[PDB]
Short mmCIF file of N, CA, C and O in Angstrom, two decimals:
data_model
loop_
_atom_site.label_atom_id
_atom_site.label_comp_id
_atom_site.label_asym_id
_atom_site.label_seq_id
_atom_site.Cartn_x
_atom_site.Cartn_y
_atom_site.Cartn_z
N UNK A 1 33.97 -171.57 -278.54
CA UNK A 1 32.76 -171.78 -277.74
C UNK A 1 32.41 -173.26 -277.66
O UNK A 1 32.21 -173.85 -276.60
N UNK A 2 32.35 -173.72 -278.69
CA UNK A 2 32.38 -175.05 -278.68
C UNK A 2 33.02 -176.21 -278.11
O UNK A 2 32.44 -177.21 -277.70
N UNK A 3 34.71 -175.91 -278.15
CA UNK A 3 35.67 -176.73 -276.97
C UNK A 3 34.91 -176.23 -275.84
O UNK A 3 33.91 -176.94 -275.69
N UNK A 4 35.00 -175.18 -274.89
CA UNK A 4 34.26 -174.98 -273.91
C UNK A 4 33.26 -175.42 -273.09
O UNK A 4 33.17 -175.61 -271.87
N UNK A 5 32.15 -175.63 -274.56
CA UNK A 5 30.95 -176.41 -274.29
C UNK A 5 31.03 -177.81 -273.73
O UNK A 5 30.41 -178.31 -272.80
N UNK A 6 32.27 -178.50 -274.82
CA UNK A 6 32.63 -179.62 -274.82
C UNK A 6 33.57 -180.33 -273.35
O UNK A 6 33.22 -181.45 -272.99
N UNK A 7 34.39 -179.81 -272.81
CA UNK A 7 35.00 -179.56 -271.69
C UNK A 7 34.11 -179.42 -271.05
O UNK A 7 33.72 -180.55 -270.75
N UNK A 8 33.38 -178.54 -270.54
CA UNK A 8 31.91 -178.80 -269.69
C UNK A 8 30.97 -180.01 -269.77
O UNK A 8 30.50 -180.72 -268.89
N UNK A 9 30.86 -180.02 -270.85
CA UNK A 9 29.75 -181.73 -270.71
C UNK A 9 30.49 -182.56 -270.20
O UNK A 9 29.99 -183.50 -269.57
N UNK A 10 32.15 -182.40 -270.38
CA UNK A 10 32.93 -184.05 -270.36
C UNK A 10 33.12 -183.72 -269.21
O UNK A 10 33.83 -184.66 -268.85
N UNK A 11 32.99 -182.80 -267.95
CA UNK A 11 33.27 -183.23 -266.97
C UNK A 11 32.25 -183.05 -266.39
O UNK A 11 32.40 -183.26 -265.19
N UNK A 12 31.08 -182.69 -266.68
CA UNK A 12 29.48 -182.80 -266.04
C UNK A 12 29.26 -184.71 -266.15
O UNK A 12 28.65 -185.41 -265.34
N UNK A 13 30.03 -185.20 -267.50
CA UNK A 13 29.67 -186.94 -267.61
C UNK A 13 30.81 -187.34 -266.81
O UNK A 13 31.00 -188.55 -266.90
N UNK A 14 31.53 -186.81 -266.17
CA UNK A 14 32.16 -187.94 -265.31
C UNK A 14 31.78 -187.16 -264.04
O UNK A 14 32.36 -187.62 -263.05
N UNK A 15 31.06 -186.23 -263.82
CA UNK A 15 30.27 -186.23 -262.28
C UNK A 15 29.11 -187.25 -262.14
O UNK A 15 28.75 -187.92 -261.17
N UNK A 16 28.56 -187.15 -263.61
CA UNK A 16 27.23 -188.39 -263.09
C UNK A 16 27.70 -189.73 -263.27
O UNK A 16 27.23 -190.64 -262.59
N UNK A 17 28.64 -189.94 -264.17
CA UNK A 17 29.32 -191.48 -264.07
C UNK A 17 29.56 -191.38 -262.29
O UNK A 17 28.54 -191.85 -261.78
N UNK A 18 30.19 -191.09 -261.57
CA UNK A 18 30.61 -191.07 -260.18
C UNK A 18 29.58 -191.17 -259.09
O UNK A 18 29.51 -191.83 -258.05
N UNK A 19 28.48 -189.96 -259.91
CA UNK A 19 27.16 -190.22 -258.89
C UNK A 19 26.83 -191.60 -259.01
O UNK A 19 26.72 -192.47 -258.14
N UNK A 20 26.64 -191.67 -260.66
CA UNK A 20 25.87 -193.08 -260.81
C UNK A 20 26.44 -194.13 -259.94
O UNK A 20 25.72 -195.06 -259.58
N UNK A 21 27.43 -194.07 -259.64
CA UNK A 21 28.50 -195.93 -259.61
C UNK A 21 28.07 -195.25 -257.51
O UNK A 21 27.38 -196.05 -256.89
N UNK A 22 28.38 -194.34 -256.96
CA UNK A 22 28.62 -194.28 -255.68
C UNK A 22 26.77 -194.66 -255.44
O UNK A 22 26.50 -195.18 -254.35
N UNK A 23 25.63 -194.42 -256.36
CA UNK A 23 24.39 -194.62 -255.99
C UNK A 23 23.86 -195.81 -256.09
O UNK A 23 23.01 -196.14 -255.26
N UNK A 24 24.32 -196.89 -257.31
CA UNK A 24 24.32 -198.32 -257.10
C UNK A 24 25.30 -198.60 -256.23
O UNK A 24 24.99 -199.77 -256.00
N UNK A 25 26.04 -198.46 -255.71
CA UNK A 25 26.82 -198.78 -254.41
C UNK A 25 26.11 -198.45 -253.27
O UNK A 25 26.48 -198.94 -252.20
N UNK A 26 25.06 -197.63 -253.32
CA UNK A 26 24.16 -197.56 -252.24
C UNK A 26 23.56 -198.57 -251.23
O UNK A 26 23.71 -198.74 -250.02
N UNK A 27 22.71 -199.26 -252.35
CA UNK A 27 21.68 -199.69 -251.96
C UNK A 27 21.75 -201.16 -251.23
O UNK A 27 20.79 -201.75 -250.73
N UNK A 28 23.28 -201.68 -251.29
CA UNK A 28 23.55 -202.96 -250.63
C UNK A 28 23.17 -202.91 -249.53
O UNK A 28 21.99 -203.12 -249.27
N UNK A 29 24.52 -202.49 -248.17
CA UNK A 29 24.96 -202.69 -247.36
C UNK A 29 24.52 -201.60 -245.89
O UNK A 29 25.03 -201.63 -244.77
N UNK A 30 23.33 -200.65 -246.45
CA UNK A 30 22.59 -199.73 -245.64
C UNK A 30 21.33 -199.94 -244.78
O UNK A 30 20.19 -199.68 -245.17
N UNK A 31 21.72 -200.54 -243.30
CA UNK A 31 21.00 -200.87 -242.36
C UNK A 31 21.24 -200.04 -241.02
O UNK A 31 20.20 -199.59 -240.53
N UNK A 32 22.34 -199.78 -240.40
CA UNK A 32 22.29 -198.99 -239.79
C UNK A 32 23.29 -198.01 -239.31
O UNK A 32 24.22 -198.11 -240.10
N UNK A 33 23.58 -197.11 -238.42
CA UNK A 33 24.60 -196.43 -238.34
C UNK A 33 25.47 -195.27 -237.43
O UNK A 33 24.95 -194.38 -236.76
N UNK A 34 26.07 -195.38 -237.49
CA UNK A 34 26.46 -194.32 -236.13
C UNK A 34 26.03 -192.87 -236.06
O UNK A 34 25.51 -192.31 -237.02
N UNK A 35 26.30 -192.09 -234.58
CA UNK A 35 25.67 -190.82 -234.49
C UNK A 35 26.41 -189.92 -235.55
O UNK A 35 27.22 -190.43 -236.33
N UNK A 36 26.09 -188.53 -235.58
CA UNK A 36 26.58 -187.87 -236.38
C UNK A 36 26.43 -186.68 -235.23
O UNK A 36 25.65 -185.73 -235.26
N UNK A 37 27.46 -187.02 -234.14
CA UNK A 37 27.35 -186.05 -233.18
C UNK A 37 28.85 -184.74 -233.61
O UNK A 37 28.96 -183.56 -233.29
N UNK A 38 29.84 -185.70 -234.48
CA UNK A 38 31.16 -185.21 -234.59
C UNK A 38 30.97 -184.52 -236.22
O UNK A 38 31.87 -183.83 -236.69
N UNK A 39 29.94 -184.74 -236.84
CA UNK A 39 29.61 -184.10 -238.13
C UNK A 39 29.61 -182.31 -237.74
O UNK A 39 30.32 -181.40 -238.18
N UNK A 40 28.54 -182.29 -236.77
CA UNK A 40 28.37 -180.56 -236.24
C UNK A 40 29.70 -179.67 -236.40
O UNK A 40 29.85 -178.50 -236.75
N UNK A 41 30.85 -180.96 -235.89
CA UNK A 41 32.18 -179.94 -235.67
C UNK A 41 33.34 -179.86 -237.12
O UNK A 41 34.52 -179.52 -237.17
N UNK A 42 32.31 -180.37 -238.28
CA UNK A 42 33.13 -180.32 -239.24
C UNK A 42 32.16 -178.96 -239.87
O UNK A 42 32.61 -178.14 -240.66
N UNK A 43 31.03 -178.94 -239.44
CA UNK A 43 30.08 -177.90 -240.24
C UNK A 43 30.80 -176.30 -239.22
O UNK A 43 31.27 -175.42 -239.95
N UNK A 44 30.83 -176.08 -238.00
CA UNK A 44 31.40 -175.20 -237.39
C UNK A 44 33.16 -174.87 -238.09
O UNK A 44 33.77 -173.82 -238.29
N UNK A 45 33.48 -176.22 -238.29
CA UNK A 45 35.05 -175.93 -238.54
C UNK A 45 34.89 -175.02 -240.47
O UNK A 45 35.75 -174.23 -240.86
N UNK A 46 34.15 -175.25 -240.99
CA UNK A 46 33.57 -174.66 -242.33
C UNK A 46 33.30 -173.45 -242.04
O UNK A 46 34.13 -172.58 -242.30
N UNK A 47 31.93 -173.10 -241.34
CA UNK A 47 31.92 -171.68 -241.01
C UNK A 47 32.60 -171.05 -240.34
O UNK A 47 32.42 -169.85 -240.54
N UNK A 48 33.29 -171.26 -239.64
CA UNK A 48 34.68 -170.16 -239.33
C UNK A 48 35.76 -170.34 -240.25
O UNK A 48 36.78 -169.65 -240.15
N UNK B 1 35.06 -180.82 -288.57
CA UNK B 1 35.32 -180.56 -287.31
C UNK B 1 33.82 -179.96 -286.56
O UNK B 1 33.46 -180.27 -285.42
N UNK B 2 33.01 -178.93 -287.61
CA UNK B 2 32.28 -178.64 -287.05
C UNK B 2 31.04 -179.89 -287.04
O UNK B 2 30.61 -180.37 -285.99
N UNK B 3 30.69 -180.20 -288.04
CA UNK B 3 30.16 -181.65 -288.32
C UNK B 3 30.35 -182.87 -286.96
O UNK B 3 29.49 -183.45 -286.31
N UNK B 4 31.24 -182.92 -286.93
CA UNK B 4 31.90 -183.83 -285.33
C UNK B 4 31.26 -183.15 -284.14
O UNK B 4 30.39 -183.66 -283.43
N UNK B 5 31.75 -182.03 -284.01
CA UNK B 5 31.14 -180.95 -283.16
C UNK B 5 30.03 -181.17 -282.39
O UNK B 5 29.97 -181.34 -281.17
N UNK B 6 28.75 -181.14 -283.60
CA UNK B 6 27.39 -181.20 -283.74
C UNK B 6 26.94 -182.51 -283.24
O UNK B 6 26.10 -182.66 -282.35
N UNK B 7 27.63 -183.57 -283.94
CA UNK B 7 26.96 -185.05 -283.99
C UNK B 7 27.86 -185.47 -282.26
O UNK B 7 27.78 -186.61 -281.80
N UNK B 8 28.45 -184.63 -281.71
CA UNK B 8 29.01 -185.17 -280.39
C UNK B 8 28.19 -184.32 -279.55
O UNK B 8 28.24 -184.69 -278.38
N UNK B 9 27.36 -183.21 -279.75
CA UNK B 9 26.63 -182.37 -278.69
C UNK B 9 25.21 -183.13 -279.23
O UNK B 9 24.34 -182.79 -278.43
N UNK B 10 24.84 -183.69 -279.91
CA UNK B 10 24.01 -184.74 -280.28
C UNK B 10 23.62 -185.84 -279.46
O UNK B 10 22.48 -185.97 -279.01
N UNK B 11 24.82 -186.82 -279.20
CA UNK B 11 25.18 -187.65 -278.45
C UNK B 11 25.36 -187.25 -277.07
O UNK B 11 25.06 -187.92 -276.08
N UNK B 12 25.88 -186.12 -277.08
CA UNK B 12 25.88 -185.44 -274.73
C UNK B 12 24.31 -185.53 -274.40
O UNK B 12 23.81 -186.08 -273.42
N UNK B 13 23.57 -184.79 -275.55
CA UNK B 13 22.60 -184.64 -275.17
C UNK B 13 21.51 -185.91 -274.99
O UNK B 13 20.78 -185.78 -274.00
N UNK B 14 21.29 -187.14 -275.80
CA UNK B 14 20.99 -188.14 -276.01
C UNK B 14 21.22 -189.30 -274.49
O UNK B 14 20.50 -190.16 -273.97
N UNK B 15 22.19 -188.93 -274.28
CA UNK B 15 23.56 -189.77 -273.21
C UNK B 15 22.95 -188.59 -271.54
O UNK B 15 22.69 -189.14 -270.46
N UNK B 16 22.88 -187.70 -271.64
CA UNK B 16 21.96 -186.98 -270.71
C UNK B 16 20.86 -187.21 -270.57
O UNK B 16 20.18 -187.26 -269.55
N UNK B 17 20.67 -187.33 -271.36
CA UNK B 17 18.57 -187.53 -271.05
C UNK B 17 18.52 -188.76 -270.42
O UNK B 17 17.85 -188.97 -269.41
N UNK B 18 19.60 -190.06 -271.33
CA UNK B 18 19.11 -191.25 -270.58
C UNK B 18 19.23 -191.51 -269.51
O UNK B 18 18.51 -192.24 -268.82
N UNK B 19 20.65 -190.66 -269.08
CA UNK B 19 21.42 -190.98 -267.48
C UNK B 19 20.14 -190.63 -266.61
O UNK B 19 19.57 -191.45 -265.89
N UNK B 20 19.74 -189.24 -266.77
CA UNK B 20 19.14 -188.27 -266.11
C UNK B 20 17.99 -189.88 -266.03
O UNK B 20 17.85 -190.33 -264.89
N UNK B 21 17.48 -190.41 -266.84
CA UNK B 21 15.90 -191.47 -266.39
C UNK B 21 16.41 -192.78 -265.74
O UNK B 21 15.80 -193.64 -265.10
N UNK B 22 17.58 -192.68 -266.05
CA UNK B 22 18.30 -194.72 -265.53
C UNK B 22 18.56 -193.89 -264.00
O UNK B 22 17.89 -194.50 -263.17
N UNK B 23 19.01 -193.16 -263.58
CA UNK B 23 19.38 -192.34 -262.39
C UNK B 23 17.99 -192.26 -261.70
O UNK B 23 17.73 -192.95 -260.72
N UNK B 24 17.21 -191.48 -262.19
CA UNK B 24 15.69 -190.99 -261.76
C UNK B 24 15.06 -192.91 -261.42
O UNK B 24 14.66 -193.15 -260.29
N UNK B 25 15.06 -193.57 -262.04
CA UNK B 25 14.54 -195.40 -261.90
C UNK B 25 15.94 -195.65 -260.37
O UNK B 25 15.86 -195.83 -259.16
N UNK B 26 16.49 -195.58 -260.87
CA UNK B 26 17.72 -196.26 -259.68
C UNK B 26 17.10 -195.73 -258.50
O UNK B 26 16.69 -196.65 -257.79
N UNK B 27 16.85 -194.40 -257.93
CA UNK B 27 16.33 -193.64 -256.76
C UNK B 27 15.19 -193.82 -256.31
O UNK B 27 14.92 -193.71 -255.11
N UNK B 28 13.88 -194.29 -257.74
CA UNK B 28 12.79 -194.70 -257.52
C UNK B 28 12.85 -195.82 -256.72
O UNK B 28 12.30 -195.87 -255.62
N UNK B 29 13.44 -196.69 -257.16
CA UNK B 29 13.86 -198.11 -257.01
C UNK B 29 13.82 -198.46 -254.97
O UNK B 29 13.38 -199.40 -254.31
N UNK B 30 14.47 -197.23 -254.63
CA UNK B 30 14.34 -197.87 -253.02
C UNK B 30 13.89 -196.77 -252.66
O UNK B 30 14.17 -195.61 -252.94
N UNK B 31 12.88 -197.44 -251.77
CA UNK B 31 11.65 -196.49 -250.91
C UNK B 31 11.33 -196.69 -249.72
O UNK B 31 10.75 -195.89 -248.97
N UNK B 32 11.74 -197.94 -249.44
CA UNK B 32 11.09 -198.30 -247.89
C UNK B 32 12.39 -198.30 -247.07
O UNK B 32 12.34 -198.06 -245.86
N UNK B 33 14.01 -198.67 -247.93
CA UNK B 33 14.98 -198.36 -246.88
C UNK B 33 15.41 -197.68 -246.20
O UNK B 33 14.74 -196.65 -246.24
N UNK B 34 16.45 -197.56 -245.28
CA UNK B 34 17.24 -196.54 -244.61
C UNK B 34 17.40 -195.10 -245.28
O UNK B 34 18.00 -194.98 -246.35
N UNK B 35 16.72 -193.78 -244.47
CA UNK B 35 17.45 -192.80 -244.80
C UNK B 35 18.52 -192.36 -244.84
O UNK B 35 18.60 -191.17 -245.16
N UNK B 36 19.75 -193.10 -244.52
CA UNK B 36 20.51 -192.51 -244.92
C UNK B 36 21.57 -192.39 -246.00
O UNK B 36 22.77 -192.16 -245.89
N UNK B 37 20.75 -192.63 -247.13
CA UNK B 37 20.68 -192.12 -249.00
C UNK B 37 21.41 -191.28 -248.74
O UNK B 37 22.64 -191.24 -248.68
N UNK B 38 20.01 -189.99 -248.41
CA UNK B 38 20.60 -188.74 -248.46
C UNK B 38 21.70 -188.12 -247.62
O UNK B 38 22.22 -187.01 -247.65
N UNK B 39 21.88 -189.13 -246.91
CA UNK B 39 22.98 -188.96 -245.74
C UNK B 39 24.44 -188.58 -246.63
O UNK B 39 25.13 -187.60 -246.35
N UNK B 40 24.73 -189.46 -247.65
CA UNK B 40 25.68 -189.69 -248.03
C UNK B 40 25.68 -188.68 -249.25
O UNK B 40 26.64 -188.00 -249.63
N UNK B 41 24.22 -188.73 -249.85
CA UNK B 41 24.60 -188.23 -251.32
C UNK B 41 23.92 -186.55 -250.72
O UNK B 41 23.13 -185.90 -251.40
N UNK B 42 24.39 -186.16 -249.51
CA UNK B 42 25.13 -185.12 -249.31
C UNK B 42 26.45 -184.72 -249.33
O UNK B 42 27.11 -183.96 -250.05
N UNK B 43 26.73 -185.58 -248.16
CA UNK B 43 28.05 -185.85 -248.07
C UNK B 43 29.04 -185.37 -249.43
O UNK B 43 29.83 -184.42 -249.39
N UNK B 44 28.88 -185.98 -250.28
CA UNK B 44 29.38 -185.80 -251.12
C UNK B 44 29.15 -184.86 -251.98
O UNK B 44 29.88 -184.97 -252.97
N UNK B 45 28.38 -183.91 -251.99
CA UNK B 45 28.35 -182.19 -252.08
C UNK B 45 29.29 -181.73 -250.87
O UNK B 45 29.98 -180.71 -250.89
N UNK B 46 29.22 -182.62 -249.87
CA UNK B 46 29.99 -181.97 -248.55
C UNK B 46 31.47 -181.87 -248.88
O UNK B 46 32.08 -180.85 -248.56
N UNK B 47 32.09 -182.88 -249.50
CA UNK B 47 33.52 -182.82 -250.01
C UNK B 47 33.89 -182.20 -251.25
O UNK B 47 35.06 -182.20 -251.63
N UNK B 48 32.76 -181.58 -252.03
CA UNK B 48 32.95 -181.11 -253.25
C UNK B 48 32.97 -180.21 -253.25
O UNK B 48 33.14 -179.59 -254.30
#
């Protein structure tokens, strides 16, 4: 139970290491940006 | 082993709490910029 546990935290800490680093990577270079007219056809291509 | 065990679910937990407030400050941190934060830190539920 314990490896288990352990294996779960260690890859719950390298999801937030990843969040963390992609969320200070945020905050530079975000001014403006293109449509998200071609996003719709990745959400349609999902639900079917 | 079990001793190790303990004093390392000690430390996840310790190492969680802080991420969870340095994370929670980082997000505080920008308020007046571009929405599209959440643009991305969807996104990336979107590929996951």
């Amino acid at each position: 139970l314990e490896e288990a546990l352990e294996a779960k935290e260690e890859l719950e800490r390298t999801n937030k290491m990843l969040k963390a680093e992609m969320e200070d990577l945020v905050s530079s270079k975000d001014d403006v940006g293109k449509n998200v007219h071609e996003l719709e056809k990745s959400k349609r291509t999902l639900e079917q």
